[PDB]
Amino acid sequence: APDREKALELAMAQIDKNFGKGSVMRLGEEVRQPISVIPTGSISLDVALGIGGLPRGRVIEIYGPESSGKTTVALHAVANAQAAGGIAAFIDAEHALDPEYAKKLGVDTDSLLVSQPDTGEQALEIADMLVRSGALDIIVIDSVAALVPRAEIEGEMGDSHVGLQARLMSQALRKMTGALNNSGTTAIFINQLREKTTTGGKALKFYASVRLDVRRIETLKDGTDAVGNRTRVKVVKNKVSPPFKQAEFDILYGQGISREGSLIDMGVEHGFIRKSGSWFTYEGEQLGQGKENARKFLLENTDVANEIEKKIKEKLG
Numbered sequence: 001a002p003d004r005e006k007a008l009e010l011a012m013a014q015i016d017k018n019f020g021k022g023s024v025m026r027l028g029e030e031v032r033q034p035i036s037v038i039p040t041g042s043i044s045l046d047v048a049l050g051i052g053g054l055p056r057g058r059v060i061e062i063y064g065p066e067s068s069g070k071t072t073v074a075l076h077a078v079a080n081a082q083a084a085g086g087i088a089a090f091i092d093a094e095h096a097l098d099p100e101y102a103k104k105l106g107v108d109t110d111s112l113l114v115s116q117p118d119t120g121e122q123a124l125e126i127a128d129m130l131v132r133s134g135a136l137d138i139i140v141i142d143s144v145a146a147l148v149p150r151a152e153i154e155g156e157m158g159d160s161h162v163g164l165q166a167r168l169m170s171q172a173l174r175k176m177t178g179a180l181n182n183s184g185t186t187a188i189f190i191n192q193l194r195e196k197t198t199t200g201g202k203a204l205k206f207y208a209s210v211r212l213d214v215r216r217i218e219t220l221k222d223g224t225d226a227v228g229n230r231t232r233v234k235v236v237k238n239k240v241s242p243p244f245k246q247a248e249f250d251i252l253y254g255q256g257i258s259r260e261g262s263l264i265d266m267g268v269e270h271g272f273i274r275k276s277g278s279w280f281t282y283e284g285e286q287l288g289q290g291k292e293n294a295r296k297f298l299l300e301n302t303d304v305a306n307e308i309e310k311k312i313k314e315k316l317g
Contacts, residue, residue: 022239029242038086038138038186041076041105042249043262043312045212045233050241052317053080054210056137057184058240059177061144061204063191064214069231069251071096072105073214074140074188076257079106081186086137089113091127093146105256119150120165120200124172127187132179137186144169144191144200163199170203177207211237220250222292228252250295260298263305263312264291272311282308 015023021033037053039046046052054060054077062070078088083106090097092114099109113130117123124147127139141147149164180187189208191201205211213234220228232248250261264280264287267273273282273294280287280294282304287297298305 020239022241025242027242027244031241033240035240036184038077038084039080040073041080041257042073042233042247043309044247044249044266045073045235047266047316048233048235048245048247049210049238050245054186054188055240056186057181058186058209059173059180059204059207060186060188060210060212061191061201061208062188062212062214063193063201064212065216066192066194068214068216069229069233069249070190070192070212070214071142072251072256073212073233074142074190075102075105075107077186077188078102078112078138078140079108081138082106082108082111084137087111087113087135089115089127089130089136089139091123091139091141092116093123093141094143097142101254104254119153120147120168120172121150123147124168124176128172128176128179131176131183131185131187134183134185136183139185139187141187141189144189144204145194147200165199166202169200170207173203173207208237209239210235217248220252220292222290226253227292228255228258258295259309260295260305263298263309264294266312267308270312270315272308 012024031050033051035051036056037051038056039053040049062073064070082088090112093116095116103109115126117126123141127141130136131139147165147169149168151164189204191204213236215232216229217232218230219226220230228251230248230250232246234246235243237243248265250258252258264273268275273280273287279289280291285304287294
């Protein structure tokens with residue numbers, strides 16, 4: 001009588017109806033659920049996520065060490081959302097944002113709502129109001145660690161020394177998630193780690209539908225000098241697609257996420273662009289000796305790459 005698979009399936013279906021689509025899914029599984037998505041500004045990371053972009057109306061957390069690429073991803077996300085005619089908001093609490101750069105990554109700063117809150121409670125409450133206004137596509141919160149409660153913000157003693165921030169951060173999501181979902185607004189929560197987990201990244205752990213583990217890995221040199229850095233991201237949690245997938249992408253100094261960078265990288269693996277030792281070629285054409293030269297190569301001949309972006313964008317999504 002037992003048909004393990006017919007047996008398992010039924011159960012699984014229940015698991016999902018009881019806790020939501022994605023409550024449990026086979027890693028090898030492919031997707032059909034399209035959502036509505038904000039492109040991570042990275043073809044790979046997009047493919048990684050399994051829906052090509054950050055899901056909408058979901059709580060997202062991008063964490064990692066200082067200067068690793070988290071923000072840039074955040075920034076691209078925003079920009080795209082705006083390109084699609086979406087409204088955006090930045091709850092700042094670290095005063096770091098370089099509007100100039102954001103502009104360069106496609107951001108329309110001049111239309112970017114920005115708030116620089118007095119307390120974690122305010123930073124969080126101000127975002128919730130903005131969210132349930134239902135007119136925002138994306139909302140970015142800079143520095144979850146800076147979401148220090150107000151009791152601590154105002155000179156207050158060590159009595160009642162507590163993990164108050166976690167509570168603050170937690171209660172804040174129990175109430176916010178709902179709205180976001182209804183408002184179809186995606187909320188990235190840039191959560192940085194430094195030894196200047198604990199403190200608010202503990203509640204976001206269970207309230208996020210996607211958790212990216214941004215991290216740097218190699219300083220692009222090309223010949224013998226600085227041009228950029230290569231980041232790797234490991235979706236550690238994806239509740240709308242099989243989790244644990246990975247992705248890498250270049251970020252030349254000043255520039256954002258290199259389009260051609262991705263092209264050459266992905267192309268190679270998917271095999272459209274072959275690499276004999278030390279050299280790159282595409283259907284007879286010699287892109288160049290050395291990724292960088294290959295980048296320039298593609299950065300110049302727009303038609304090419306444009307077809308390999310195509311050839312690539314074809315085999316998948």
